[PDB]
Each structure stands twice: as structure tokens, then as C-alpha cells.
Design a protein around this ligand. Structure first.
Ligand SMILES: CCCCCCCCCCCC(=O)OC[C@H](COP(=O)(O)OCC[N+](C)(C)C)OC(=O)CCCCCCCCCCC
Ligand SMILES: CCCCCCCCCCCC(=O)OC[C@H](COP(=O)(O)OCC[N+](C)(C)C)OC(=O)CCCCCCCCCCC
Ligand SMILES: [Cl-]
Ligand SMILES: [Cl-]
Ligand SMILES: [Cl-]
Ligand SMILES: [Cl-]
Ligand SMILES: [Cl-]
Ligand code: NA
Ligand code: NA
Ligand code: NA
Ligand code: NA
Lengths: 311, 311, 311, 311, 311
């Protein structure tokens, strides 16, 4: 078994199609996702042509090892791909129709800058190395590129599954490569993040600000230190769900900024008490009275600025 | 080996039956469950017929590769479903009786809206792609569809295992597909949720309300902030056992609402102290006196409204 | 290859023997355990009989695929059995001696009612489906059922490994089935639970009771709320090591009851302070004096009652 | 393929050699470790004797299935027969030189009594069951038993890799078994345990003892209760890294003992306050003055005793 | 199939080349990383030579088992290397061009001394054991050693992928071995460590130092003990991301040192109160006044010293 010869010097066009059956396990930390799909290949092998009449059939079936199959590989698969062939059909002129059912753990990077409001473009790269006799080029048969209606990704909205029709042509180890880009467009379902992380995080911060309506140092220290600890718990919880990025994520920025607010509240609480002990509650009163407006205003403005910078 | 010819233009009916041997590992976060079962296939292959009077043997045994077997696949499976063929029996008439023992990690979505009081309908979809020569259609032999009595799914009650008898016949990639729906009806054993999460969560909330019977700001801040922290621990613990949903779960709603109660208890505690310092304990006394009745009443009513909206 | 014919209409007796090599990974949450053992099968195949004299040898070695081997399957195994044939020997008269080395992740339910003082009966069910020519029945050769002396289970005491000699006989999907029951009797090593969970849990509760020798509301609130939080930590830690049961476990009951003791100490602490503020320390003194004896006595009685109900 | 004939009643000697390439993943909880090594087997098969002149080669090479290979099995593994034959060399006399690369998850119990100062003796047991025709006995070729210099075990010091030269010959299920014991001697690198667990644990305990220089009940309750909670965190963290033992580990004993110190510190703090309220600060003063010396002294002695009992 | 004979007594040179397709899962605790790459082998087999003109084809293709392939094996790999042969090409002169696509979990130790500012040199060791007929030696074809532009390692910067050109030739078990060192140079992206661990850790420490501007013992005990607990949380969080080293890591040193600062702050807070009670607030005032300057200064000095010692 060896590649089909070119009539002229033409390259061999393998028509591809990925049809998603299942989407699952989008792992944020690992930047991987698992897929269950149909891979369809179609090419011209003249050596396998036949006359419909003298055969008694309009189409012929084959076993994988009986005929030449192009070595289509996945560029970005974590766990060594396992594939079982479902059908091989040969039409009169020698057109092969390959159909396999595969499943792989695809590794595609994610952009966490707008987390948890972010949207992602997942990739599946098909590749084919050209052989000694002739060159192999990939093409997309848009007719066999889809995803079923049932397909759901847990915690994500599946927008589209398209393929970049023009393959990327290049050389690797003095050999011609044909690479294709299948793109899964998804957007994160941020709903749950609101009552589970964002709102509890805001509540504990507002609770900390009640120290602005209290003259009790011992109570203020308990209010501010306690809420700060609860904020550390939320910070830790958030950072366990995410990988370590070389940039600031939106949630990350908000969380980091809230530390500054706790820190300044501590300073204020400290200052107010210090002045009170030094017998000048009048200066302490005015700093506390300002704080009651200042913190909410500055917090709100800081957030407006951040949202602007990030969106 | 190739499909049996139709006498007429008729499609081939493959009779299916799934008999559950074991149910295990219902993972809520992943929305998967593992199964260990018997798959039985039965169809008409005229090429394998024989006379019963002359043959001597009433039933003929075969090895898988010796005869044509229809490619029955599972739609919603994760881990490759290993299959061990246990027996192949041919009727003298030509009827085939296939029996395999399989095991798979099945991926079926779950509805967490009523958690931990929810009930689920797990699916196992069988599929068969039609071949070149003739079309294949699936059917249910209710006689070979069951589950053994021993079958238990840890933390769940197994209600029923039925199959939707009418297959979903549709065209995919210019070929006809026959899909069958086996349904496992299960309901969650909520018992453990009561003394482990629900009651401790209520106790800490009631402990927080004792601040309505004390004039000590320092003690009230310790009561309300501490219990609030313990409530965050329960919230975190609960949300780790569940996937991120684009909707509110029942437990989620209760938990979120309790934050509002803590927040308002802080405001009250703050107000009471502020008035006390301002030398008007009379207004503070009446706000506190109201709070005792108000809090339990409103909490109770709120719960009734929520349980109503959810059930 | 097909089953040996009955001289008469008699069923075929397959003699089974399991010798445990290793026991490991008893997973409480999953209710599974892993095993490494020898499986021995022995049956009469008349077709391979011989005369010890003319054949030249009294023993005859064989390869698996060369002769008919009965399809002995494991019922309750999660991880798809992988079997290595170590030896196949044929006696002159035609008796076969099969010996395989297997390893499986066995799924067997556990009774957590007396946890961590519980004892368990783990099961390994061998099964054999009868074929169309003749019926197959299982039997135990007590001579080949054991476990080596080195066999240990981490955190458990291995009491006995016996097999129920009389096999179950039943019909499944119109064919006869022979199931056996191998039983591994184990008891939990509760030792570590005493200084790691039980004693720290008791200490924090006794620490909570020192509030009965204090008139300081602010100190009492700190004592009772703090220890209650530490009790939540122990509760959470315990419930992570166990699956969600539809019943109350012993540890579970004790833990749940201790919440009531915290709750009532809060009420007491609240009452004492309230009376003190209302200028009646005499009533408060007598309530606190009573609590000093009541709390320990009631706790002790409650425990005796529980231990009685559970053991 | 069948075993070599005994030229006389003599058993067959298979010479073994394990050469460690990699050591990794010593899992304390599971009591397992993973290994990557060379297994070398060498025995005499006279049936494979040849003439270097006639066959035109000084050494013959073979494929595994072409010749008889003794079934050498690993006793204490979970690994499930992973490997690759690197070479098979047969010299003219019939000496076979088998060399395979293997990797396994060996399961060997650990002694946690002196943790984290403990040393362990890991085992790899090779076994061979004797066949029908003749008996097989194992032997160690000390020349082929080693470990490369690069071999490192994360968090452990590798002392020696020797093999017990005399095999353990015994009877199992009516056949002769030859067992070999390869021993990996390792000692735990306790360094990290000092600044991560031991010193922070001592610091929080000493912090608790400052309550012996304070007359403030509210401050003492905060000191002792808080540090006790931090001690629970360390206890939990430690017990997650260890399996549940039926004995007391060194760390376990220290940790358990520190609970008694917290408990008695609470009693003291309680007593001191009670006396103060009762208007006898003189008795309280003498109890607190004693406590300062008492606690350090007793703690120190208790530790001298434990280190003595354990080492 | 056997090794090609030397014209002279010369050793056989196998030219190697590793071309990284993907880098993923650098596990700090396990000291492993996963790789997806091309392995290219090239050697001279005179037995496969032929005429370019008379033969008619310039290059001839072969299947793996048809020709002799040198047994090139990876030293430091965990999961069995999965090899998919992509192409085998023979030059007319008899040179072979092997190209496989492999993926492995590589075990390479890491230096945590400068964590999280550390840089690592990952290794991939290729090895070849010489055979009985002739010796095999490895060499690097720098032309086929690279990594694609897309290659990214999450949380790391990929510096370079070079190979040490001179093989390490040594004797192991009487046969000669040729080992090659491919080196992946990477540096850790420390960015995220700054707002997630380092800055929150500094903030809580500065918050603890406000006790130097307070005379309230009860508030100081709450400030210092609370922040100390938050520091333990950060310590625990950090040590879960790292393996147990026999040395001090940079972060480890900083973290350990901060415990000393908390401890001395406790002593100060204790001293100040003790003096206040003893009616000497003048000595207490001067100790706190000194502490206000000493703590920040000594902290700043100590850090400079540490960074010096570590960088
Ligand atoms: C704090 C709030 C405590 C939560 C109380 C239970 C909520 C609820 O509503 O529980 C209700 C569910 C059952 O509902 P179902 O029959 O499955 O729904 C179908 C209902 N239709 C058909 C009308 C739509 O639980 C029970 O059997 C009640 C026992 C749980 C009591 C726990 C007390 C604490
Ligand atoms: C509190 C103390 C915080 C620790 C601060 C970084 C310590 C250090 O030393 O940071 C230094 C490292 C880089 O070191 P390098 O170039 O790889 O070493 C080369 C050593 N030679 C010459 C011996 C080979 O980080 C930086 O680029 C600094 C940015 C991080 C600042 C974090 C501020 C908070
Ligand atoms: Cl392919
Ligand atoms: Cl099938
Ligand atoms: Cl079997
Ligand atoms: Cl072997
Ligand atoms: Cl190779
Ligand atoms: Na082919
Ligand atoms: Na407090
Ligand atoms: Na063999
Ligand atoms: Na070969």
C-alpha cells in the first residue's frame, strides 16, 4: 500500500469534516477540553476505480488495512488519540469516503483577562505530512462540518463550530505540511459567579464599612480583620479555579483592589482610635465622617475605571 | 462479510435490550455515571438459515468475526466502552441472538433546580448508522430490558429503567440514523443533607439572632460576623459538590438569601449601637424589640415563598 | 471450539478457587476495594482424555485458544477485568486445571451505621451463563480458596476469606446462571479516630462549657462561637471521608447532637447576660449553676442512650 | 513452546536482576511507590544450542513468542504487566539472556511510628510458579542488580538497593513457588517538616502561654481559643498526609499531647478569672505565677519522655 | 532482521532529532512535564542500498517490521511512550530516515531554591543499548532539533530547546550505552504570585503592626493573633503547590521569617500590657515607640539579607 499517483504533477486533496457528537470537561487550569466526534475524510484514489455494470454494484466497501489511507493527525491532543473506523466507501471513479468516530482531550489556550465574563475560541488542528511520491493538501467539506443540537458544554454557551477553509501550508523537517483550523466559539455562563462569589464578596466589604459608624476600636478591629479574613477565603477559592496567568484577570483586579480598601480601613480605624486616646475626638470625627462618603464613592469610581479598562 | 439482503426494499430491524448489572459513580459536577450491563442484539440474516429436521442441532453458535454484526454504537459515552461478547446463537430460521457484556461512563445532563430534593432522568442512547446496501432501524425487545434487584446507586434511589420504544430516525451526513433512548429514573436521597448542611446552617443563623437580646456592640459584632463566616464555609462546601449552573438551585437560593439576613442583622447591630452612643436608647430599644419578631417572621415567610416558587 | 457434550443430560461442574495475593484501596466514598488474586478453574472435558501409558506422559500443557474454556465472569467489578493465564493442565482422563492471575476494582456496598467501629462483609461474585448445548454450574474447591499471610488491608483487619459453597441458581434472559459468593470479612481499625477526631471534638466542647464559670458575656460569646466553629471543621472533615448515607451513622449522630449542646449553651449565655442587664443576677446565677451539672450529665446520658441504640 | 527438559532430576535456575532507572511517587497514604527498571532473566535452554560456524553468527537473537520464556511475575504490584523486551540473546551452549524494561506501582507497607524521622525498607517480590514437566527456582545475579546514580526519590534519601540472594521456596495450590526479595532502603528527608509544621506549631503554643502574664479574661480566652484553632489546622493538615494507623505516630503523639496543654491552659485561664471575680486575686496570682514555670517545664519533660519512648 | 554489518569494525551512528509540537502539564509537586513531539532517527544500513538510475525511484518507503530499526528508548519517562511511526525513507546509498510522533510524561527534577523567581533546565534523555554484533552510538542532527512557534507552557516562559551534541558513552551490564541530553530551558512567570500571595501576605503583616499605635491589649491580641492565622493560611496554600524539599526555598524563608515577627509582636503586646498593669506606662510607651521603627526596619534589613543570600 502506497499513495495514489498524480495524473499530472497535482497535489492530493483530502476533504475533511469534523462533526461534534459530545463536548465535555473544559478544564480551566489545564486549558483542555474533551471531544467526541466524527471525522470524515474523502479523496481520489484512481487505482480503486471500477465500472458499475461489470461489478454489479454502484459503491464498494473496504476494510482500513486493504487500501491506502492518508495519515491525518491531530496537532494538539493531550492523550494519544484512539479512533475506530465506521465506514469506507468507494464510488465509481475511485472516490474514497472515510468516516471514523474519534474522541480526544484537546489542548487549546484560554484568555482569562475578562474572567468570568470572557469568551473563548477553542481550536482543533488537523495536519497531514506529505509523502515522498506526492504532496497532500487538506480542504474543508462544509457539508460534513457541524455539531448536533443536543451538544452542550457544562458551564459554557456553544456559539459556533466553523472551520477556517484555507489550510496553512508550510515546511517541517524538509517536508510539506497541510494544517487545518476547526474553531469552537464558546462564552462562559457567568450567572453562578454573581450569587456565589461577587455578591458575598461585596456584602463582607460593606459589613467592614460599618466601622465608619462606630467609635469602638475593639469592635472595629473585629469587624475589619474578620471580613478581611473572609475576603482571603474568597480570593483563595477564586484562584484555585484558575491557572497562574502572566496578566491580571478582571476578577483578580477587583479582588486585589479590595485588599487596598481593607488596608486603608485598618489605617482609618487605627487613626480614629489614636486621636480618641490623644483627646482629640473632633479630628477623629471628621476623618470618620469623610470615610463614610469617601470609601463608597472611591470604591464605585475605581470599579467604573476597571470595567472601562477591561471591557 | 456484508449486510443481509432485503427480500423487498425493507429496512433491517435490530432488536435491542440493555440489562443493568451495576450502577455506580453518579458524578454531579461532571454529569456522568458509570454502568455495567448486558447489551442484547437480535436480527434476521437469511444467509444463516437452515433446516431444523436434518441439521441435528437446534441452535448454532458463532464467533463474532465469522458473521455480520450491526455496528451498534453509544452516543453519550465518555470512556471507550469495552465490549466482551458472551454469546452468538443462530435460530435454524436464521435469527441471530447477540449478547455482550459492556461497561461505560455515560454522560447525561442533570437538573439541579430542586437540589438536594431533585429527581433525574438519565439517558443511554443507542445508535446505528445505515450502510450502502440497506437501511438499519432499531427496536426495543421489552423482554430483555431490565436491571437486577441488587443494583444500587450510592446516594440515589433507582425508580425505573424503561426504554422509549419508538426510535428517533433521522438523516446525518447523507445516511440514515436510528437512535433509541433508554431512561434510568432516579431520585436523590436528601436525608444526609438535613443534619450535615441544612440544620447546622439554621443553627448558626439562629445563634446570630441572639444579638437582638443584647446591648453589647462588641459581643453583637462577634456573634454576627462569626456566624456569617461559618455561613460562608457552608456556602463554599455546598458549591464544591455542584457544577456551575446558569440558573438558581434551591439550596443556592436559601444560602443566598441568608446573606441578606446577615447583612441586615449587621445594619441593625450598627444602628442600635449608633443610637445608644447618641444617647437615645429608647429608639434603639424599639428597633431591637421589632427585630426579634421581624427576623424570624420574614425568614419564615421568605422560605415559604421560595419553596413555593421551586416546588 | 464448543462445550463438552453430556454423557447423560447432566450439567457441567466448574470448580472455582480464589487465592488472594493482595488487598488494597478500600475506598469508603466509592464503596470499592482493589484485589490481586489467583483464579483457578477445573472441569471435565471428555474430548481430551488419554491413556497415561501410550501417550508417554501423565500431564498435558495447553494454550488458552486451543481448547474450550468456560466464560467465568465477575459480577461486581468496576475496572474491566484483565486476566493473565498462568497455566492450563490436562489430566489423562481429561480433567482441566486452569489458573489465572487477575486484579480487579470490586464494587461492594458498605454499612456505615456503626462508623468508625463498623465491620464489613466484602463480596466477589463469580458468574457463568449456560450455553445452548448444555448447562454450566459452579462449585467451590475449598482446597484452592485462600489468602497469603502477608495480605493486609490498610486501616482494616482481615478476619476471614470464605466462599459460600452452595451457588445461587437463577434464570436471566431465558438462560440458566450459576453465581457464587466469595466473602472477605473485615473490621475497621478505629484506633486513629480516637486521638484525631473523637478526643479533639470532646476537648473543644468541654472548653465551651467553661462559659458556665464566667459572667463575661463578651468572653462567653467568644468561647461558645469559636469552639462551635472548630466543631463545624470536625463535622466537615468527617463527612468528606464518608459517602452520603440515607441513614444516621454513629459518628454522625454524636456530631449532630453536639450542635444541640452548642445551641443551648448560646441560649444559656444569652439568658444569663439578659438577666444580668435587667438587674437580676440571682436568677442568672442559678441558671448558670444548674447548667454546670446539667450539661455534663445530659451529655453523658445522651451518649449512653446513643451507644445503646447503635450497638 | 514448552519448558527445557531436565537432563537429570534438577530444577531450572532462572537468574534475575533488577536495575532501577527511575524511582518516583512514594505515596504515603496508599503505601505505594512507582518504579522504572530493567529486569534481566538468564537460564539454560539446550534445545536452542547452535554451531557458530554452521549458523554463521556467534550469538543468536530471538523474538519473545518464538522461544520458551519463564513466567516471572511480580507479587506486590498494581501495575498490570506493563513492559518491553529490549533483547533476547542465545549463545551456543543454550544460555538465554533476557532483558526487559518494566515500570510498576509496587505496593509495600510503611512504618509511620517515627514519622517524619522514620526510615523504610521497600520490597519488590519476584515470583515463578513451577510447571508440570519440571520445577523452576530463582537466583540473584548480583552483577545485574543495581540502580543508576541519577535515581532520586522526591523527599527521600536512597540508601541501598540489595536483593536477598536466597529465594523463598514454598508450596501453593499443589505447585512449587520460588520468590525473591529485592529491597530498597530509604530514609525520609525531615528538613521541610521543621519550618513548615514543627516550628509554627511550637510558636502558636508559646503564644498561648502569654495568657500566663495577663489578667484580662477576654484577652486570654482570645489567645488560648485562637491558637487552639490554629493547632487544629496543623493537626488536620498533618493527618491528611498520613494513612490511618492502628498505632501512634511520633508527630501524632506530640500533636495529641499539645491538645492537653491547651485544655489545661483553658482551665487555668478559667480558674484565674473565677478567683478574680470572687475577690481573691492572691490565689489566682500564685496559680498564674506557677503556670508560667509549670507549662514550659512539663512540656519540655513530656517531650523528653516521648522522644525517649519513640527513639 | 539483525543489525547492519560494519564495513570495518566501526560503531553505528544513529542521528537523532526531537522536534516539540506541544508542552504541557509541568507538575511542580511530581517534577514531571508532558511532551508531544517528533522523534527522527537516521542511520546507514548498506543492506538496503540500490541504484538511483537502474532502480528508477529516488526514495523507497518501508513499514517498521520490514527493516532493522535501532531500539532508541527514553530514560526519564513515566507513562509508556506511545509511538506512531509517520514515515521510513531510504536513500539509494542505504541511509534510513525514520520519523515518529511520540508523547511522554517526562520526569525531570526541579530546583525550588529561588521559587517563584526560579528557572529550570528540563531534560529528555535518549538512550541506545549496543548489540552483540556491533556498537551503536548516538549523534545530534541539529537540523531536526527544534520546537514550533505555537509551543507554550502554561505559567512558564520557554527560553530554548537545545541538545548536548556529545553523547555520554558508558558501560552498563557488560554492554555499551549511548545517552543524549536534550534540554528545555524555562523560567517561571512570577507575575501572579505578586497580587495573589506576596502582597496579601505583606498587607496582613502591616495590619499586625498597627498594634504598635494601640494601648488596648484586647484589641492588640485580636490584631496579632488574627493576622497570624491568615499568615498560616498563606503558608499552607504555598506549601501545597510545592514538593517537600531538603532545602529552604526563597518563599519558604520569607514565610518562616514572618512567623518570628508575629512571635516578637506578641511578646511586645504582652510586655506593653504587663508594664501598663504594673503602673509603668512610661517604659511601655518607649518599647512601643521603638517597635514602631524597629519592626519595619529589621523586616526591611532581613529581606535585603535574604534576597542577597538567595540571588
Ligand atoms: C431551611 C429550609 C429547609 C428545607 C425544607 C425542605 C424543602 C422542601 O420543599 O422539601 C420538599 C421535598 C419533596 O418535594 P418533591 O416531592 O420531591 O417535589 C415534587 C412536588 N410537586 C409535585 C408538588 C411539584 O422534601 C421532602 O420530602 C420534605 C422533607 C425535607 C424536610 C427538611 C426539613 C429541614
Ligand atoms: C517582600 C520581598 C518580595 C520579594 C521580591 C523579589 C525578590 C527578588 O530577588 O526578585 C528578583 C527576581 C529576578 O531574579 P533573577 O534575575 O532571575 O536572578 C539573577 C541572579 N544571579 C545574578 C545571581 C544569577 O524578580 C524580579 O525580577 C523582581 C520583581 C518581583 C518584585 C516583587 C515585589 C513585591
Ligand atoms: Cl489515520
Ligand atoms: Cl456492536
Ligand atoms: Cl474466562
Ligand atoms: Cl515474563
Ligand atoms: Cl525505536
Ligand atoms: Na491503509
Ligand atoms: Na474578639
Ligand atoms: Na514464549
Ligand atoms: Na524492525
Amino acid at each position: 500500500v502506497s499513495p495514489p499517483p498524480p495524473i499530472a504533477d497535482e497535489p492530493l486533496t483530502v476533504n475533511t469534516g469534523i462533526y461534534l457528537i459530545e463536548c465535555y470537561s473544559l478544564d480551566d487550569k489545564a486549558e483542555t477540553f474533551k471531544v467526541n466526534a466524527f471525522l470524515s475524510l474523502s479523496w481520489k484514489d484512481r487505482r480503486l476505480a471500477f465500472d458499475p455494470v461489470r461489478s454489479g454494484v454502484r459503491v464498494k466497501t473496504y476494510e482500513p488495512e486493504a487500501i491506502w489511507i492518508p495519515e491525518i493527525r491531530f496537532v494538539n491532543v493531550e492523550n494519544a488519540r484512539d479512533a475506530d473506523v465506521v465506514d469506507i466507501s468507494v464510488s465509481p471513479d475511485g472516490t474514497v469516503q472515510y468516516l471514523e468516530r474519534f474522541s480526544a482531550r484537546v489542548l487549546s489556550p484560554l484568555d482569562f483577562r475578562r474572567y468570568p465574563f470572557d469568551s473563548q475560541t477553542l481550536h482543533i488542528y488537523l495536519i497531514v505530512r506529505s509523502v515522498d511520491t506526492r504532496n497532500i493538501v487538506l480542504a474543508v467539506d462544509l457539508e460534513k462540518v457541524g455539531k448536533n443540537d443536543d451538544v452542550f458544554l457544562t458551564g459554557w454557551d456553544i456559539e459556533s463550530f466553523t472551520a477556517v477553509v484555507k489550510p496553512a501550508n508550510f515546511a517541517l523537517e524538509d517536508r510539506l505540511e497541510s494544517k487545518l483550523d476547526y474553531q469552537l466559539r464558546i462564552s462562559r455562563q457567568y450567572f453562578s459567579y454573581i450569587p456565589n462569589i461577587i455578591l458575598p464578596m461585596l456584602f463582607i466589604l460593606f459589613i467592614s464599612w460599618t466601622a465608619f459608624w462606630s467609635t469602638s476600636y475593639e469592635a472595629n478591629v473585629t469587624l475589619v480583620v474578620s471580613t478581611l479574613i473572609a475576603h482571603i477565603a474568597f480570593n483563595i477559592l477564586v484562584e484555585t479555579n484558575l491557572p497562574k496567568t502572566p496578566y491580571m484577570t478582571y476578577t483578580g483586579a477587583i479582588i486585589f483592589m479590595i485588599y487596598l480598601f481593607y488596608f486603608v480601613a485598618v489605617i482609618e480605624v487605627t487613626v480614629q482610635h489614636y486621636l480618641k486616646v490623644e483627646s482629640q475626638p473632633a479630628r477623629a470625627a471628621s476623618i470618620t465622617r469623610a470615610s463614610r462618603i469617601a470609601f463608597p464613592v472611591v470604591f464605585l469610581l475605581a470599579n467604573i475605571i476597571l470595567a472601562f479598562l477591561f471591557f
